[PDB]
Amino acid sequence: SLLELGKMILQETGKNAITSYGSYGCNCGWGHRGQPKDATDRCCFVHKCCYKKLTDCNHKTDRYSYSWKNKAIICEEKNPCLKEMCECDKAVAICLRENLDTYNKKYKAYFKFKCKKPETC
């Protein structure tokens, strides 16, 4: 669920998921689609491609089990659909952290800013 995703994002990036990524660029923001503005935004495109293909559970509301152990995310989920959700979320947390060096606050509030047509997953 968004609860596990939010916690993973804090653990890896040190940031608040809602305020720092909830409206960022053309892909991180919620409901946002379009060509990525930068590497951070590309992480979010990959993330949505990852979870939107899962048909058997809900990315937003279904909780799964994971641990922050030895300073790393481990997906410890039995349900195959929920394990794939966890792996999608783990991947975006890592990706956002690895691209913190180009995180740009100009994209932070981008809901009303125009985006190019999205590319294919």
Swiss-Prot record:
Entry function: Snake venom phospholipase A2 homolog that lacks enzymatic activity. Has myotoxic activities. A model of myotoxic mechanism has been proposed: an apo Lys49-PLA2 is activated by the entrance of a hydrophobic molecule (e.g. fatty acid) at the hydrophobic channel of the protein leading to a reorientation of a monomer.
Protein name: Basic phospholipase A2 homolog MT1
Localization (cell): Secreted
Section covered of the full-length record: 17 to 127 of 137
Lineage: Eukaryota, Metazoa, Chordata, Craniata, Vertebrata
Subunit description: Binds to heparin.
Family: Belongs to the phospholipase A2 family. Group II subfamily. K49 sub-subfamily.
Disulfide bonds: 28-44, 43-95, 50-88, 57-81, 75-86
Protein's UniProt keywords contain Calcium: no
